[model samples]
Target: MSAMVQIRNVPDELLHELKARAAAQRMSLSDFLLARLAEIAEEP
Candidate 1:
């Protein structure tokens, strides 16, 4: 299992947009972030 990562001080606008996008995609925030991060990790 991965350790929890705590991200603090995200701007309101940025957080709002991210949340909105996640909702639009029918995904939880953590799931959305993990999927995106995995994509980044896979990039070569």
Candidate 2:
């Protein structure tokens, strides 16, 4: 599977928060976002 997902128009504040969370955990933003997405899918 070579599919890719891209989100546009996210608020700068939201982006900064997510980036900070990733930094705190020493995780790349991609990995952090992937893990969050996986959790959401499993929930509903």
Candidate 3:
């Protein structure tokens, strides 16, 4: 089963940038974040 995560108090500028990136890829914020998180987990 998958678990839920919540982030708090993100800066508006950063949030907007992330949303823009997600839009460029035609993905939702949650899917974009999850994809990035998976890449991060793969790093040494």
1-44, model 3: which lDDT tens digit per residue? 99999999999999999999999999999999999999999999
Q: Model 2's lDDT to the true fold? A: 0.90
- lDDT by residue (tens digit), candidate 1, 1-44: 67878899999999999999999999998889889999999999
lDDT-better candidate, 1 vs 3 = 3
Off-target runs (Cα >4 Å) in candidate 3 are none
Candidate 1 segments whose C-alpha is farther than 4 A from its true place: none
- Clash count for candidate 3 is 0
Query: TM per model?
Result: 0.88, 0.82, 0.91
Clashes of each: 0, 0, 0
Per-residue error at 33 for model 2, in Å? 0.4
lDDT per model vs. reference: 0.92, 0.90, 0.97
Worst 10 residues of 2 by lDDT: 1-10
TM-score-wise, the better of 1 and 3 is 3
Global CA lDDT computed for model 3? 0.97
Give residue 21's lDDT in candidate 2 (0 to 100). 99
How far out, in Å, is residue 10 in model 2? 1.0
Q: Could you list the CA RMSD of all candidates, in the order they appear?
A: 0.9, 1.2, 0.7
